[PDB]
Amino acid sequence: MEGDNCVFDGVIYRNGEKFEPNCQYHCTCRDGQIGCVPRCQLDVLLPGPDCPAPKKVAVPGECCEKWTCG
C-alpha cells in the first residue's frame, strides 16, 4: 500500500527513509518495499598478459574491493 513503512533485518524504516546496511549499499524504503543501489564500481577486468586470473579482493581501510592479479 501507499505510504507503508518497511522492515529490513529487524529494523523498521519509514516510507521515503534512506539507510546503509553496510558501506557498499544505499537503500530506500518506498511504500513497503526496499530498493538499494551499489556504491562501489561493479566493473569487469578480463585476463591480461601479465594478469591471467584477475580477482577482486578486500583492501585494508577501503570499503570497496580492488582488482589484483592472482
The first five atom37 places (N, CA, C, CB, O) and aatype in JSON, in Angstrom:
{
  "aatype": [12, 6, 7, 3, 2, 4, 19, 13, 3, 7, 19, 9, 18, 1, 2, 7, 6, 11, 13, 6, 14, 2, 4, 5, 18, 8, 4, 16, 4, 1, 3, 7, 5, 9, 7, 4, 19, 14, 1, 4, 5, 10, 3, 19, 10, 10, 14, 7, 14, 3, 4, 14, 0, 14, 11, 11, 19, 0, 19, 14, 7, 6, 4, 4, 6, 11, 17, 16, 4, 7],
  "atom_mask": [
    [1, 1, 1, 1, 1],
    [1, 1, 1, 1, 1],
    [1, 1, 1, 0, 1],
    [1, 1, 1, 1, 1],
    [1, 1, 1, 1, 1],
    [1, 1, 1, 1, 1],
    [1, 1, 1, 1, 1],
    [1, 1, 1, 1, 1],
    [1, 1, 1, 1, 1],
    [1, 1, 1, 0, 1],
    [1, 1, 1, 1, 1],
    [1, 1, 1, 1, 1],
    [1, 1, 1, 1, 1],
    [1, 1, 1, 1, 1],
    [1, 1, 1, 1, 1],
    [1, 1, 1, 0, 1],
    [1, 1, 1, 1, 1],
    [1, 1, 1, 1, 1],
    [1, 1, 1, 1, 1],
    [1, 1, 1, 1, 1],
    [1, 1, 1, 1, 1],
    [1, 1, 1, 1, 1],
    [1, 1, 1, 1, 1],
    [1, 1, 1, 1, 1],
    [1, 1, 1, 1, 1],
    [1, 1, 1, 1, 1],
    [1, 1, 1, 1, 1],
    [1, 1, 1, 1, 1],
    [1, 1, 1, 1, 1],
    [1, 1, 1, 1, 1],
    [1, 1, 1, 1, 1],
    [1, 1, 1, 0, 1],
    [1, 1, 1, 1, 1],
    [1, 1, 1, 1, 1],
    [1, 1, 1, 0, 1],
    [1, 1, 1, 1, 1],
    [1, 1, 1, 1, 1],
    [1, 1, 1, 1, 1],
    [1, 1, 1, 1, 1],
    [1, 1, 1, 1, 1],
    [1, 1, 1, 1, 1],
    [1, 1, 1, 1, 1],
    [1, 1, 1, 1, 1],
    [1, 1, 1, 1, 1],
    [1, 1, 1, 1, 1],
    [1, 1, 1, 1, 1],
    [1, 1, 1, 1, 1],
    [1, 1, 1, 0, 1],
    [1, 1, 1, 1, 1],
    [1, 1, 1, 1, 1],
    [1, 1, 1, 1, 1],
    [1, 1, 1, 1, 1],
    [1, 1, 1, 1, 1],
    [1, 1, 1, 1, 1],
    [1, 1, 1, 1, 1],
    [1, 1, 1, 1, 1],
    [1, 1, 1, 1, 1],
    [1, 1, 1, 1, 1],
    [1, 1, 1, 1, 1],
    [1, 1, 1, 1, 1],
    [1, 1, 1, 0, 1],
    [1, 1, 1, 1, 1],
    [1, 1, 1, 1, 1],
    [1, 1, 1, 1, 1],
    [1, 1, 1, 1, 1],
    [1, 1, 1, 1, 1],
    [1, 1, 1, 1, 1],
    [1, 1, 1, 1, 1],
    [1, 1, 1, 1, 1],
    [1, 1, 1, 0, 1]
  ],
  "atom_positions": [
    [[0.83, -1.2, 0.0], [0.0, 0.0, 0.0], [0.87, 1.26, 0.0], [-0.94, 0.0, 1.22], [2.05, 1.22, 0.36]],
    [[0.27, 2.38, -0.41], [0.99, 3.64, -0.5], [1.23, 4.22, 0.89], [0.22, 4.64, -1.37], [0.32, 4.28, 1.71]],
    [[2.47, 4.65, 1.14], [2.85, 5.24, 2.41], [3.28, 4.26, 3.47], [0.0, 0.0, 0.0], [3.63, 4.67, 4.58]],
    [[3.28, 2.96, 3.18], [3.7, 1.95, 4.14], [5.18, 2.1, 4.49], [3.43, 0.56, 3.6], [5.99, 2.52, 3.66]],
    [[5.51, 1.75, 5.73], [6.89, 1.59, 6.17], [7.43, 0.22, 5.72], [6.99, 1.73, 7.71], [6.68, -0.61, 5.2]],
    [[8.73, 0.01, 5.92], [9.42, -1.21, 5.54], [10.16, -1.78, 6.74], [10.39, -0.95, 4.38], [10.54, -1.05, 7.66]],
    [[10.37, -3.1, 6.73], [11.19, -3.76, 7.73], [12.37, -4.41, 7.02], [10.37, -4.82, 8.54], [12.19, -5.16, 6.06]],
    [[13.57, -4.11, 7.49], [14.76, -4.74, 6.93], [15.64, -5.19, 8.08], [15.53, -3.77, 5.98], [16.01, -4.38, 8.93]],
    [[15.98, -6.48, 8.1], [16.91, -7.04, 9.08], [16.5, -6.64, 10.5], [18.34, -6.58, 8.79], [17.35, -6.34, 11.34]],
    [[15.19, -6.65, 10.75], [14.68, -6.38, 12.08], [14.53, -4.92, 12.44], [0.0, 0.0, 0.0], [14.18, -4.61, 13.58]],
    [[14.78, -4.01, 11.51], [14.66, -2.58, 11.76], [13.54, -2.02, 10.89], [16.0, -1.84, 11.47], [13.46, -2.33, 9.7]],
    [[12.68, -1.2, 11.49], [11.64, -0.54, 10.71], [12.23, 0.71, 10.08], [10.4, -0.18, 11.59], [12.89, 1.5, 10.75]],
    [[11.99, 0.88, 8.79], [12.36, 2.09, 8.08], [11.1, 2.75, 7.55], [13.36, 1.79, 6.92], [10.21, 2.07, 7.04]],
    [[11.01, 4.07, 7.66], [9.79, 4.73, 7.26], [9.79, 4.94, 5.76], [9.63, 6.07, 8.0], [10.84, 4.99, 5.11]],
    [[8.58, 5.07, 5.2], [8.42, 5.39, 3.79], [9.27, 6.6, 3.44], [6.94, 5.64, 3.45], [9.28, 7.59, 4.16]],
    [[9.98, 6.5, 2.32], [10.91, 7.54, 1.94], [12.21, 7.6, 2.72], [0.0, 0.0, 0.0], [13.09, 8.38, 2.36]],
    [[12.38, 6.8, 3.78], [13.61, 6.83, 4.57], [14.74, 6.07, 3.86], [13.37, 6.23, 5.96], [14.51, 5.07, 3.19]],
    [[15.97, 6.57, 4.03], [17.17, 6.0, 3.43], [18.13, 5.48, 4.49], [17.86, 7.04, 2.55], [18.22, 6.05, 5.58]],
    [[18.84, 4.41, 4.17], [19.79, 3.85, 5.14], [20.88, 3.1, 4.41], [19.06, 2.93, 6.15], [20.79, 2.86, 3.2]],
    [[21.9, 2.72, 5.16], [23.04, 1.97, 4.63], [23.23, 0.72, 5.47], [24.34, 2.83, 4.61], [23.66, 0.83, 6.62]],
    [[22.91, -0.47, 4.96], [23.15, -1.67, 5.77], [24.63, -1.97, 5.91], [22.44, -2.87, 5.15], [25.04, -2.6, 6.89]],
    [[25.44, -1.54, 4.95], [26.9, -1.55, 5.02], [27.4, -0.43, 4.12], [27.5, -2.96, 4.59], [26.61, 0.25, 3.47]],
    [[28.73, -0.23, 4.09], [29.31, 0.86, 3.3], [29.15, 0.66, 1.8], [30.78, 0.98, 3.63], [29.33, 1.61, 1.04]],
    [[28.8, -0.54, 1.36], [28.72, -0.84, -0.06], [27.36, -0.55, -0.69], [29.06, -2.27, -0.28], [27.24, -0.57, -1.91]],
    [[26.32, -0.28, 0.11], [24.98, -0.13, -0.47], [24.22, 1.04, 0.16], [24.18, -1.41, -0.29], [24.41, 1.37, 1.33]],
    [[23.36, 1.66, -0.65], [22.47, 2.73, -0.22], [21.04, 2.28, -0.53], [22.81, 4.09, -0.93], [20.73, 1.97, -1.68]],
    [[20.18, 2.26, 0.49], [18.85, 1.69, 0.38], [17.79, 2.73, 0.69], [18.7, 0.49, 1.32], [17.99, 3.63, 1.49]],
    [[16.64, 2.58, 0.03], [15.49, 3.45, 0.25], [14.24, 2.6, 0.44], [15.3, 4.44, -0.93], [14.01, 1.65, -0.3]],
    [[13.45, 2.95, 1.44], [12.15, 2.34, 1.66], [11.11, 3.13, 0.86], [11.78, 2.3, 3.17], [11.0, 4.34, 1.01]],
    [[10.35, 2.44, 0.01], [9.33, 3.07, -0.83], [8.04, 2.26, -0.72], [9.8, 3.18, -2.33], [7.93, 1.19, -1.32]],
    [[7.08, 2.76, 0.06], [5.76, 2.16, 0.15], [5.83, 0.67, 0.49], [5.0, 2.36, -1.15], [5.17, -0.15, -0.13]],
    [[6.65, 0.34, 1.49], [6.73, -1.02, 1.98], [7.77, -1.89, 1.31], [0.0, 0.0, 0.0], [7.95, -3.03, 1.72]],
    [[8.46, -1.39, 0.29], [9.46, -2.19, -0.41], [10.8, -1.48, -0.4], [9.01, -2.48, -1.85], [10.88, -0.29, -0.7]],
    [[11.87, -2.21, -0.05], [13.23, -1.67, -0.02], [13.89, -1.88, -1.38], [14.07, -2.33, 1.09], [13.86, -2.98, -1.93]],
    [[14.48, -0.82, -1.91], [15.41, -0.93, -3.03], [16.74, -0.34, -2.61], [0.0, 0.0, 0.0], [16.8, 0.55, -1.77]],
    [[17.83, -0.86, -3.21], [19.19, -0.47, -2.87], [20.05, -0.34, -4.12], [19.81, -1.5, -1.91], [19.85, -1.05, -5.11]],
    [[21.0, 0.59, -4.07], [21.96, 0.76, -5.16], [23.39, 0.56, -4.66], [21.82, 2.16, -5.79], [23.7, 0.96, -3.54]],
    [[24.25, -0.05, -5.45], [25.65, -0.2, -5.04], [26.36, 1.13, -5.04], [26.37, -1.18, -5.96], [26.1, 2.0, -5.87]],
    [[27.27, 1.27, -4.09], [28.14, 2.44, -4.02], [29.53, 2.16, -4.57], [28.25, 2.91, -2.6], [30.3, 3.1, -4.78]],
    [[29.87, 0.9, -4.82], [31.13, 0.53, -5.44], [30.96, 0.42, -6.95], [31.67, -0.79, -4.85], [29.84, 0.42, -7.46]],
    [[32.08, 0.33, -7.66], [32.08, 0.09, -9.1], [32.08, -1.41, -9.34], [33.31, 0.76, -9.79], [33.09, -2.08, -9.14]],
    [[30.94, -1.95, -9.78], [30.87, -3.37, -10.09], [31.4, -3.59, -11.51], [29.42, -3.91, -9.96], [30.68, -4.04, -12.4]],
    [[32.68, -3.25, -11.7], [33.26, -3.31, -13.03], [33.82, -4.69, -13.31], [34.36, -2.25, -13.17], [33.72, -5.61, -12.49]],
    [[34.42, -4.83, -14.49], [34.86, -6.11, -15.02], [36.3, -5.94, -15.48], [33.93, -6.61, -16.18], [36.66, -4.91, -16.06]],
    [[37.12, -6.95, -15.24], [38.51, -6.95, -15.67], [38.83, -8.34, -16.19], [39.49, -6.53, -14.52], [38.73, -9.32, -15.45]],
    [[39.2, -8.43, -17.46], [39.44, -9.69, -18.15], [40.91, -10.11, -18.05], [39.03, -9.58, -19.6], [41.78, -9.27, -17.87]],
    [[41.18, -11.41, -18.16], [42.57, -11.88, -18.07], [43.47, -11.12, -19.02], [42.65, -13.38, -18.36], [43.12, -10.88, -20.18]],
    [[44.64, -10.74, -18.52], [45.57, -9.94, -19.26], [46.89, -10.66, -19.39], [0.0, 0.0, 0.0], [47.09, -11.71, -18.77]],
    [[47.81, -10.11, -20.18], [49.04, -10.85, -20.5], [49.86, -11.15, -19.26], [49.88, -10.07, -21.48], [50.46, -12.22, -19.17]],
    [[49.91, -10.22, -18.31], [50.59, -10.42, -17.03], [49.61, -10.62, -15.88], [51.49, -9.25, -16.75], [50.02, -10.58, -14.72]],
    [[48.34, -10.83, -16.18], [47.28, -10.89, -15.17], [46.29, -11.95, -15.62], [46.58, -9.49, -14.96], [45.2, -11.62, -16.09]],
    [[46.65, -13.23, -15.49], [45.81, -14.28, -16.08], [44.55, -14.54, -15.3], [46.59, -15.55, -16.2], [43.57, -15.04, -15.85]],
    [[44.54, -14.21, -14.01], [43.45, -14.55, -13.11], [43.1, -13.32, -12.29], [43.83, -15.75, -12.18], [43.34, -13.29, -11.08]],
    [[42.52, -12.29, -12.92], [42.1, -11.12, -12.15], [41.08, -11.52, -11.1], [41.5, -10.04, -13.08], [40.17, -12.3, -11.37]],
    [[41.25, -10.98, -9.9], [40.33, -11.28, -8.8], [40.19, -10.05, -7.92], [40.83, -12.5, -7.98], [41.19, -9.41, -7.58]],
    [[38.96, -9.72, -7.54], [38.7, -8.59, -6.66], [38.76, -9.05, -5.21], [37.33, -7.95, -6.98], [38.14, -10.05, -4.84]],
    [[39.52, -8.32, -4.4], [39.86, -8.69, -3.03], [39.7, -7.46, -2.14], [41.32, -9.25, -2.95], [39.98, -6.33, -2.55]],
    [[39.24, -7.69, -0.9], [39.22, -6.64, 0.1], [40.61, -6.04, 0.32], [38.67, -7.18, 1.42], [41.62, -6.74, 0.2]],
    [[40.64, -4.76, 0.64], [41.87, -3.98, 0.76], [41.82, -3.22, 2.08], [42.04, -2.99, -0.46], [40.77, -2.7, 2.43]],
    [[42.93, -3.15, 2.83], [42.89, -2.53, 4.17], [42.41, -1.09, 4.13], [44.27, -2.58, 4.81], [42.88, -0.29, 3.32]],
    [[41.46, -0.77, 5.01], [40.97, 0.6, 5.12], [40.16, 1.1, 3.95], [0.0, 0.0, 0.0], [40.03, 2.31, 3.77]],
    [[39.61, 0.21, 3.13], [38.81, 0.59, 1.97], [37.48, -0.13, 2.02], [39.56, 0.27, 0.66], [37.42, -1.31, 2.35]],
    [[36.41, 0.6, 1.69], [35.11, -0.04, 1.63], [35.06, -1.07, 0.51], [34.01, 1.0, 1.44], [34.65, -2.21, 0.73]],
    [[35.47, -0.68, -0.7], [35.24, -1.49, -1.88], [36.43, -2.38, -2.19], [34.94, -0.59, -3.07], [37.58, -2.03, -1.92]],
    [[36.13, -3.54, -2.77], [37.17, -4.46, -3.21], [37.88, -3.91, -4.43], [36.57, -5.84, -3.51], [37.3, -3.17, -5.23]],
    [[39.15, -4.28, -4.56], [40.03, -3.78, -5.61], [40.62, -4.95, -6.4], [41.15, -2.92, -5.02], [40.7, -6.07, -5.91]],
    [[41.02, -4.66, -7.63], [41.5, -5.71, -8.52], [42.93, -6.09, -8.18], [41.4, -5.26, -9.98], [43.77, -5.24, -7.89]],
    [[43.2, -7.4, -8.22], [44.53, -7.97, -8.06], [44.75, -8.98, -9.16], [44.71, -8.63, -6.65], [43.82, -9.37, -9.87]],
    [[46.0, -9.41, -9.29], [46.41, -10.44, -10.24], [46.81, -11.66, -9.42], [47.59, -9.96, -11.17], [47.86, -11.67, -8.78]],
    [[45.96, -12.69, -9.43], [46.24, -13.91, -8.69], [47.02, -14.95, -9.49], [0.0, 0.0, 0.0], [47.31, -16.03, -8.97]]
  ]
}
